[PDB]
Amino acid sequence: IQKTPQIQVYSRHPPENGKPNFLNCYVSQFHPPQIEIELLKNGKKIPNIEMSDLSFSKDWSFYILAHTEFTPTETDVYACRVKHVTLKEPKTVTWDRDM
Amino acid sequence: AEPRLPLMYHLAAVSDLSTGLPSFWATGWLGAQQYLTYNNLRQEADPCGAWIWENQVSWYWEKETTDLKSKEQLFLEAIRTLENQINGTFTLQGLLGCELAPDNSSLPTAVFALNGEEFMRFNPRTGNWSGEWPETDIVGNLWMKQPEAARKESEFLLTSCPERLLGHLERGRQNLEWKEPPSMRLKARPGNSGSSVLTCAAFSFYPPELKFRFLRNGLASGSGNCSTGPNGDGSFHAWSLLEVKRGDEHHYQCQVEHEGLAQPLTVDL
Ligand SMILES: *[C@@H]1O[C@H](CO[C@H]2O[C@@H](C)[C@@H](O)[C@@H](O)[C@@H]2O)[C@@H](O[C@H]2O[C@H](CO)[C@@H](O[C@@H]3O[C@H](CO[C@H]4O[C@H](CO)[C@@H](O)[C@H](O)[C@@H]4O[C@@H]4O[C@H](CO)[C@@H](O[C@@H]5O[C@H](CO)[C@H](O)[C@H](O)[C@H]5O)[C@H](O)[C@H]4NC(C)=O)[C@@H](O)[C@H](O)[C@@H]3O)[C@H](O)[C@H]2NC(C)=O)[C@H](O)[C@H]1NC(C)=O
Ligand SMILES: *[C@@H]1O[C@H](CO)[C@@H](O)[C@H](O)[C@H]1NC(C)=O
């Protein structure tokens, strides 16, 4: 059986322009475990991000968290991009500051 | 009855390494927090977060590593067997652990799954593996080639588990009693034609059990579409969305219930 990933983007503390914080991309409910994930700043991959251990829940589907330090500003756009067998093309999802 | 603290190990192994995953890895949990990590590209079990500072008997972490290296061999061999009698790739998972009885004795758990579905079980009091699928036989048979296997798996669950659990309940009482309430925010943004979306967000709380309830003029009005996820440092983050009429945003509030709060907390826009 295969299962497409659910993808969610949010920050650790309440966001504020010009203030240091941390950006999270939470990818869950997928199968198989083989997957690719990257964080973007204005369309360009951001280097040296971090990743949690790959784990799983009661129903056997997998989950993991990608994150990095960042300082939001009015004009920069942040996003998360993932590749998986169940996806016909890479899926890019933009950060929503209200989450 | 009372909150029964469980200790559980999450195990996995795969054949396809084209995305850089190790062949075998595992994590361990006390309730909702992770205390252990391990993967075959490193050969050692390590503590996580605050558990790095727990006062333990000197052989503790060495024994976790050895019991896990044992499980790694059983799993990887099971994969190669299947890869010989059947076509395709595989993913094998296991969920093992226990809870304490009134007399401090063990209440075990042991289930397995192949490519996403349950296909086997193990009874420690009798030493046998069961299930009803052609693969159940291929694997169970392999694991019965050596009598020590069944005996060691039985000891891990009926002796070791309750022992480590009673030990953490003692040395890590402080971490286990963690009750921290969420920081809250409520905001409005443009929605579909003629509507606004309201988002109630909760930051950095523990344990994960939490309840959202939107209010309109002070009365209950729905729970909204909600979700939760890990926050990066062991704590959790959650949010709930409700669609309302454009212009009536100010009539609404958000209220949450959590173990770390003396009573429900109400939040404003
Ligand atoms: C709270 O949570 C609610 C439920 O939760 C889940 O809901 C599901 C649906 C998912 O959203 C989960 O993530 C949620 O957890 C939530 O749900 C409510 O909203 C959803 C979303 O609107 C409702 O269902 C949706 O329906 C969609 C319909 O498919 C069309 O639109 C998609 C874009 O949104 C397209 O991707 C899709 O391909 C399809 O597109 C249209 O296709 C037409 C046919 O091919 C085409 O029409 C033709 O066009 C030609 C010209 O080109 C001619 O005109 C011809 O005559 C036409 O026939 C269109 O052009 C095309 N449109 C576009 C833009 O390309 C699904 O695709 C969605 O995936 C989703 O299922 C859902 O039903 C509803 N809930 C309920 C219970 O009903 C709710 O919104 C949440 N509330 C809040 C406040 O957040
Ligand atoms: C179980 O452990 C508790 C806590 O140390 C102890 O008080 C009790 O005597 C032990 N055995 C039983 C039967 O309660």
Coordinates of C-alpha atoms and ligand atoms in Angstrom, one line a residue:
Chain A
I1 CA 0.0 0.0 0.0
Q2 CA 1.2 3.5 -0.7
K3 CA 0.3 6.8 1.1
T4 CA 1.0 10.3 0.0
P5 CA 2.6 12.8 2.4
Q6 CA 0.7 15.5 4.3
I7 CA 3.0 18.6 4.5
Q8 CA 2.8 21.4 7.1
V9 CA 4.9 24.6 7.6
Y10 CA 5.1 26.8 10.8
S11 CA 7.4 28.7 13.2
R12 CA 8.4 27.8 16.8
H13 CA 7.6 31.1 18.5
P14 CA 5.0 33.7 17.5
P15 CA 6.6 35.4 14.4
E16 CA 7.9 39.0 14.2
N17 CA 9.8 40.8 11.4
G18 CA 13.5 41.5 12.3
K19 CA 13.4 38.9 15.2
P20 CA 15.4 35.6 15.3
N21 CA 13.2 32.5 15.3
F22 CA 13.0 28.9 13.9
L23 CA 11.2 27.5 10.7
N24 CA 9.5 24.0 10.8
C25 CA 8.3 21.8 7.9
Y26 CA 6.4 18.7 9.3
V27 CA 5.9 15.8 6.8
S28 CA 3.6 12.9 7.9
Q29 CA 1.3 10.0 7.1
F30 CA 3.4 8.5 4.2
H31 CA 4.6 5.1 3.0
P32 CA 7.1 4.0 1.7
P33 CA 9.7 5.8 3.9
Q34 CA 12.0 6.9 1.0
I35 CA 11.6 10.7 0.6
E36 CA 13.4 14.0 -0.3
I37 CA 12.8 17.4 1.5
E38 CA 14.2 20.9 1.3
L39 CA 13.6 24.4 2.7
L40 CA 13.6 27.3 0.3
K41 CA 14.2 31.1 0.6
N42 CA 13.0 33.1 -2.5
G43 CA 13.1 30.0 -4.7
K44 CA 16.6 29.0 -3.8
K45 CA 17.6 26.0 -1.6
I46 CA 18.8 27.0 1.9
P47 CA 22.1 25.2 2.9
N48 CA 22.8 23.2 6.1
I49 CA 19.3 22.5 7.6
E50 CA 18.4 20.0 10.4
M51 CA 16.2 16.8 10.5
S52 CA 14.6 14.8 13.3
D53 CA 14.7 11.0 13.5
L54 CA 12.3 9.3 11.1
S55 CA 9.5 7.7 13.3
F56 CA 6.0 6.3 13.0
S57 CA 2.5 5.9 14.6
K58 CA 0.0 3.3 15.7
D59 CA -1.3 2.8 12.1
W60 CA 2.2 2.3 10.7
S61 CA 2.5 5.4 8.5
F62 CA 5.8 7.5 8.8
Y63 CA 6.6 11.1 10.0
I64 CA 9.5 13.5 10.3
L65 CA 10.5 17.2 10.9
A66 CA 12.8 19.5 9.0
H67 CA 13.9 22.8 10.6
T68 CA 16.4 25.7 10.6
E69 CA 17.1 29.1 12.2
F70 CA 15.8 32.2 10.4
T71 CA 14.8 35.8 10.8
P72 CA 11.6 36.8 8.9
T73 CA 11.2 40.1 7.0
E74 CA 8.4 41.7 5.0
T75 CA 9.7 40.7 1.5
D76 CA 11.4 37.3 1.7
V77 CA 9.3 34.2 0.9
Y78 CA 9.9 30.8 2.6
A79 CA 8.7 27.4 1.4
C80 CA 9.2 23.6 1.7
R81 CA 9.6 21.2 -1.3
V82 CA 9.2 17.4 -1.3
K83 CA 9.7 14.5 -3.8
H84 CA 8.0 11.0 -3.3
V85 CA 6.8 8.0 -5.5
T86 CA 3.2 9.0 -5.0
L87 CA 3.8 12.5 -6.5
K88 CA 3.8 13.2 -10.3
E89 CA 6.0 16.3 -9.8
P90 CA 7.8 17.9 -6.8
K91 CA 5.3 19.6 -4.4
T92 CA 6.2 23.0 -3.1
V93 CA 4.3 24.6 -0.1
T94 CA 4.6 28.2 1.0
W95 CA 4.8 29.2 4.7
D96 CA 1.6 30.8 6.1
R97 CA 2.6 33.2 9.0
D98 CA -0.7 32.6 10.9
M99 CA -0.1 28.8 11.6
Chain B
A1 CA -7.2 3.5 36.0
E2 CA -4.8 6.3 36.7
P3 CA -2.5 7.5 33.9
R4 CA -0.6 4.4 33.1
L5 CA 2.9 5.3 31.8
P6 CA 3.9 3.0 28.8
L7 CA 7.5 2.4 27.6
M8 CA 7.6 1.6 23.8
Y9 CA 10.3 0.9 21.2
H10 CA 9.6 1.6 17.4
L11 CA 11.7 -0.6 15.0
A12 CA 12.1 -0.6 11.2
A13 CA 14.2 -2.0 8.3
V14 CA 14.1 -1.5 4.5
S15 CA 15.6 -2.9 1.2
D16 CA 15.6 0.2 -1.0
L17 CA 18.4 2.5 0.0
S18 CA 18.2 4.9 -3.0
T19 CA 17.3 7.9 -0.8
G20 CA 20.0 7.4 1.8
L21 CA 18.1 5.7 4.7
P22 CA 20.1 3.3 6.9
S23 CA 19.0 -0.4 6.6
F24 CA 17.8 -0.5 10.2
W25 CA 16.9 2.1 12.9
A26 CA 14.8 2.6 16.1
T27 CA 13.6 5.2 18.7
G28 CA 12.3 4.7 22.2
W29 CA 9.6 6.5 24.2
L30 CA 8.3 7.0 27.8
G31 CA 4.8 8.2 27.2
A32 CA 4.9 11.1 24.6
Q33 CA 8.6 12.1 24.9
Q34 CA 11.6 10.5 23.1
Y35 CA 14.4 9.3 25.5
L36 CA 16.4 7.1 23.0
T37 CA 17.8 7.0 19.4
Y38 CA 19.7 4.3 17.4
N39 CA 20.6 3.5 13.7
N40 CA 22.9 0.9 12.0
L41 CA 25.2 3.4 10.5
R42 CA 26.5 4.2 14.0
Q43 CA 26.1 1.1 16.2
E44 CA 25.2 3.0 19.5
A45 CA 22.1 3.8 21.4
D46 CA 22.1 7.4 22.8
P47 CA 19.9 9.4 25.2
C48 CA 17.9 12.4 23.8
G49 CA 17.3 15.9 25.3
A50 CA 17.0 16.2 29.0
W51 CA 17.7 12.5 29.5
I52 CA 21.3 13.3 28.7
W53 CA 21.4 14.6 32.4
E54 CA 19.6 11.6 34.2
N55 CA 21.6 9.9 36.9
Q56 CA 21.8 6.2 35.9
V57 CA 23.5 2.9 36.9
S58 CA 26.8 2.8 35.0
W59 CA 25.9 -0.1 32.7
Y60 CA 22.4 1.3 31.6
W61 CA 23.2 2.7 28.1
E62 CA 25.5 -0.2 27.2
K63 CA 22.7 -2.7 27.9
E64 CA 20.2 -0.8 25.7
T65 CA 22.7 -0.9 22.8
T66 CA 23.1 -4.7 23.1
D67 CA 19.5 -5.7 23.3
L68 CA 18.9 -3.5 20.2
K69 CA 21.8 -4.9 18.2
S70 CA 20.1 -8.3 18.7
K71 CA 16.9 -7.1 17.2
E72 CA 18.7 -5.5 14.2
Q73 CA 20.1 -8.9 13.2
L74 CA 16.7 -10.7 13.3
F75 CA 15.1 -7.9 11.2
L76 CA 17.7 -7.6 8.5
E77 CA 17.8 -11.4 8.0
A78 CA 14.0 -11.5 7.6
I79 CA 14.3 -9.0 4.8
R80 CA 16.9 -11.0 2.8
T81 CA 14.8 -14.2 3.1
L82 CA 11.7 -12.6 1.6
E83 CA 13.8 -11.0 -1.1
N84 CA 14.7 -14.6 -2.2
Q85 CA 11.4 -16.3 -2.4
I86 CA 9.3 -13.2 -3.6
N87 CA 9.8 -10.4 -6.1
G88 CA 9.8 -6.8 -4.9
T89 CA 11.0 -4.5 -2.1
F90 CA 10.0 -4.6 1.5
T91 CA 9.6 -2.6 4.7
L92 CA 9.4 -4.4 8.1
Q93 CA 8.2 -2.8 11.3
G94 CA 7.8 -3.7 15.0
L95 CA 6.1 -2.3 18.1
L96 CA 7.4 -3.8 21.5
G97 CA 6.9 -2.7 25.2
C98 CA 5.0 -2.8 28.4
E99 CA 3.1 -1.3 31.4
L100 CA 3.3 -2.0 35.2
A101 CA 0.7 -4.1 37.1
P102 CA -0.4 -3.3 40.7
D103 CA 2.2 -5.7 42.0
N104 CA 4.9 -4.1 39.9
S105 CA 4.8 -7.0 37.4
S106 CA 4.6 -6.7 33.5
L107 CA 1.7 -6.2 31.0
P108 CA 3.4 -6.7 27.6
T109 CA 2.9 -5.7 23.9
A110 CA 4.4 -7.2 20.8
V111 CA 3.1 -6.7 17.1
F112 CA 4.6 -6.7 13.6
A113 CA 3.8 -5.4 10.1
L114 CA 5.0 -5.9 6.5
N115 CA 4.7 -3.2 3.8
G116 CA 2.2 -1.3 5.9
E117 CA -0.1 -4.0 7.4
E118 CA -0.1 -6.2 10.5
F119 CA 1.0 -9.8 9.7
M120 CA 2.3 -11.2 13.0
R121 CA 2.2 -11.3 16.8
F122 CA 4.3 -12.7 19.7
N123 CA 3.2 -14.2 23.1
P124 CA 6.0 -13.9 25.7
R125 CA 4.4 -16.3 28.2
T126 CA 4.4 -19.1 25.7
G127 CA 7.3 -18.1 23.4
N128 CA 5.3 -18.3 20.1
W129 CA 4.8 -16.2 17.0
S130 CA 1.4 -16.3 15.2
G131 CA -0.4 -14.8 12.2
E132 CA -2.3 -15.9 9.0
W133 CA -0.3 -15.1 5.9
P134 CA 2.2 -16.8 3.7
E135 CA 4.9 -14.4 4.9
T136 CA 4.0 -15.1 8.5
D137 CA 5.3 -18.6 7.9
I138 CA 8.4 -17.4 6.0
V139 CA 9.5 -15.1 8.9
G140 CA 8.3 -17.0 11.9
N141 CA 10.1 -20.1 10.6
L142 CA 13.3 -18.2 10.2
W143 CA 13.1 -16.9 13.7
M144 CA 12.6 -20.3 15.1
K145 CA 15.8 -21.7 13.8
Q146 CA 17.4 -20.9 17.1
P147 CA 15.7 -21.4 20.6
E148 CA 17.6 -18.6 22.3
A149 CA 15.7 -16.1 20.1
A150 CA 12.3 -16.9 21.7
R151 CA 13.8 -16.9 25.2
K152 CA 15.6 -13.6 24.8
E153 CA 12.5 -11.9 23.4
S154 CA 10.5 -13.2 26.3
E155 CA 13.0 -11.8 28.9
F156 CA 13.2 -8.4 27.2
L157 CA 9.4 -8.0 27.7
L158 CA 8.7 -9.7 31.1
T159 CA 11.9 -8.8 33.0
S160 CA 13.8 -5.9 31.5
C161 CA 10.9 -3.6 30.5
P162 CA 9.3 -3.4 33.9
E163 CA 12.8 -3.0 35.4
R164 CA 13.8 0.1 33.2
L165 CA 10.3 1.6 33.7
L166 CA 10.4 1.5 37.5
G167 CA 13.9 2.9 37.3
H168 CA 13.0 6.0 35.3
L169 CA 9.9 6.5 37.5
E170 CA 12.6 6.9 40.2
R171 CA 15.6 8.7 38.7
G172 CA 13.7 10.8 36.1
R173 CA 10.7 11.8 38.2
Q174 CA 11.3 15.5 37.4
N175 CA 11.2 14.9 33.5
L176 CA 8.2 12.6 33.8
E177 CA 6.1 15.1 35.8
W178 CA 6.5 17.9 33.1
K179 CA 3.3 20.0 32.9
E180 CA 3.8 23.1 30.8
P181 CA 0.9 25.2 29.4
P182 CA 0.8 26.7 25.8
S183 CA 1.6 30.3 24.8
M184 CA -1.5 31.5 22.7
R185 CA -2.4 33.7 19.7
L186 CA -5.6 34.3 17.8
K187 CA -5.6 36.0 14.3
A188 CA -7.9 36.8 11.3
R189 CA -7.1 36.8 7.6
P190 CA -9.0 37.0 4.2
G191 CA -10.9 33.8 3.2
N192 CA -13.2 32.8 0.3
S193 CA -15.8 35.3 -1.1
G194 CA -17.4 37.2 1.7
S195 CA -15.5 35.3 4.5
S196 CA -12.6 35.4 6.9
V197 CA -10.6 32.5 8.4
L198 CA -9.8 32.6 12.1
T199 CA -6.7 30.7 13.4
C200 CA -6.2 29.7 17.0
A201 CA -2.5 28.8 17.5
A202 CA -0.9 27.1 20.7
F203 CA 3.0 27.3 21.1
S204 CA 5.4 25.1 23.2
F205 CA 3.2 22.9 25.4
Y206 CA 3.5 19.4 27.1
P207 CA 1.9 16.8 27.3
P208 CA 0.3 16.7 23.8
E209 CA -3.3 16.2 25.0
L210 CA -5.1 19.6 24.5
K211 CA -8.6 20.8 23.7
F212 CA -9.7 23.8 21.6
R213 CA -13.2 25.4 21.8
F214 CA -14.2 28.6 19.9
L215 CA -16.7 30.9 21.6
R216 CA -19.2 33.4 20.0
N217 CA -20.5 36.1 22.5
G218 CA -19.3 33.8 25.3
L219 CA -21.1 30.6 24.1
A220 CA -19.7 27.3 22.7
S221 CA -19.6 27.4 18.9
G222 CA -17.5 24.6 17.5
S223 CA -14.0 23.1 17.7
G224 CA -12.9 23.9 14.1
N225 CA -10.4 21.9 11.9
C226 CA -7.5 21.1 14.1
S227 CA -4.0 19.5 14.0
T228 CA -0.9 19.1 16.0
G229 CA 2.8 18.5 15.3
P230 CA 6.3 18.3 17.0
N231 CA 7.9 21.8 17.7
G232 CA 11.6 20.9 17.4
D233 CA 12.6 20.8 21.2
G234 CA 10.4 18.1 22.6
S235 CA 7.4 20.4 23.1
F236 CA 4.3 20.5 20.8
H237 CA 2.5 23.1 18.5
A238 CA -1.1 23.0 17.5
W239 CA -3.7 25.1 15.5
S240 CA -7.4 25.1 14.7
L241 CA -9.2 27.0 11.8
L242 CA -12.8 28.2 11.7
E243 CA -14.5 30.0 8.8
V244 CA -16.7 33.0 9.7
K245 CA -18.5 35.9 8.0
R246 CA -16.4 38.9 6.9
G247 CA -16.8 41.8 9.4
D248 CA -18.0 39.7 12.4
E249 CA -14.5 38.6 13.6
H250 CA -14.6 40.6 16.8
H251 CA -17.6 38.5 18.2
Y252 CA -15.3 35.4 18.5
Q253 CA -12.8 34.1 21.1
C254 CA -10.7 31.0 21.6
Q255 CA -10.6 28.8 24.9
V256 CA -8.2 25.9 25.7
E257 CA -7.9 23.2 28.3
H258 CA -4.6 21.7 29.3
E259 CA -3.1 19.9 32.3
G260 CA -0.7 22.8 33.0
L261 CA -3.5 25.3 33.5
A262 CA -5.3 25.7 36.8
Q263 CA -8.4 26.2 34.6
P264 CA -9.5 27.0 31.0
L265 CA -7.8 30.0 29.4
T266 CA -9.7 32.4 27.1
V267 CA -7.9 34.3 24.2
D268 CA -8.7 37.5 22.2
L269 CA -7.9 38.9 18.7
Ligands
LIG1 C1 -12.2 22.1 7.2 O1 -11.9 20.8 6.7 C2 -12.8 20.4 5.6 C3 -12.6 19.0 5.3 O2 -11.2 18.6 5.6 C4 -10.6 18.0 4.5 O3 -11.3 18.4 3.2 C5 -10.6 17.8 2.1 C6 -11.6 18.0 0.9 C7 -9.2 18.3 1.9 O4 -9.2 19.7 1.7 C8 -8.4 18.0 3.2 O5 -7.1 18.6 3.1 C9 -9.1 18.5 4.4 O6 -8.5 18.1 5.6 C10 -12.5 21.4 4.4 O7 -13.1 20.8 3.2 C11 -14.0 21.6 2.4 O8 -13.2 22.2 1.3 C12 -12.7 21.2 0.3 C13 -11.8 22.1 -0.6 O9 -12.6 23.0 -1.4 C14 -13.8 20.5 -0.4 O10 -13.4 19.6 -1.4 C15 -12.5 19.9 -2.4 O11 -13.0 19.7 -3.7 C16 -12.0 19.9 -4.8 C17 -12.8 19.8 -6.1 O12 -11.9 19.5 -7.2 C18 -11.6 20.6 -8.1 O13 -10.9 21.7 -7.5 C19 -9.6 21.5 -7.1 C20 -9.0 22.8 -6.6 O14 -9.5 23.2 -5.3 C21 -8.7 20.9 -8.3 O15 -7.4 20.6 -7.8 C22 -9.5 19.7 -8.9 O16 -8.7 19.1 -10.0 C23 -10.8 20.1 -9.3 O17 -10.6 21.2 -10.3 C24 -11.6 21.5 -11.2 O18 -11.9 20.4 -12.0 C25 -13.0 20.6 -12.8 C26 -13.3 19.3 -13.6 O19 -12.2 18.9 -14.3 C27 -12.8 21.8 -13.8 O20 -14.1 22.2 -14.3 C28 -14.2 22.2 -15.7 O21 -13.5 23.4 -16.2 C29 -13.6 23.5 -17.7 C30 -12.7 24.7 -18.1 O22 -11.4 24.4 -17.8 C31 -15.1 23.7 -18.1 O23 -15.6 25.0 -17.5 C32 -15.9 22.6 -17.6 O24 -17.3 22.8 -17.9 C33 -15.7 22.3 -16.1 O25 -16.4 21.1 -15.7 C34 -12.2 23.0 -13.1 O26 -11.6 23.9 -14.0 C35 -11.1 22.7 -12.0 N1 -10.8 23.8 -11.2 C36 -9.5 24.3 -11.0 C37 -9.4 25.4 -10.1 O27 -8.6 23.8 -11.6 C38 -10.9 18.8 -4.6 O28 -10.0 18.9 -5.6 C39 -10.2 19.2 -3.2 O29 -9.1 18.3 -3.0 C40 -11.2 19.0 -2.1 O30 -11.7 17.6 -2.1 C41 -14.5 19.7 0.7 O31 -15.6 19.0 0.1 C42 -15.1 20.6 1.9 N2 -15.5 19.8 3.0 C43 -16.7 19.2 2.9 C44 -17.1 18.3 4.1 O32 -17.4 19.2 1.9 C45 -13.0 22.8 4.9 O33 -12.8 23.7 3.8 C46 -12.2 23.2 6.1 N3 -12.7 24.4 6.7 C47 -11.8 25.4 7.0 C48 -12.4 26.6 7.6 O34 -10.6 25.3 6.8
LIG2 C1 5.9 -1.7 44.0 O1 6.7 -0.5 44.0 C2 6.3 0.4 45.0 C3 7.1 1.7 44.8 O2 8.5 1.5 45.2 C4 6.4 -0.2 46.4 O3 5.9 0.8 47.4 C5 5.6 -1.5 46.5 O4 5.8 -2.1 47.8 C6 6.1 -2.4 45.4 N1 5.3 -3.7 45.4 C7 3.9 -3.6 45.6 C8 3.1 -4.9 45.6 O5 3.3 -2.5 45.7

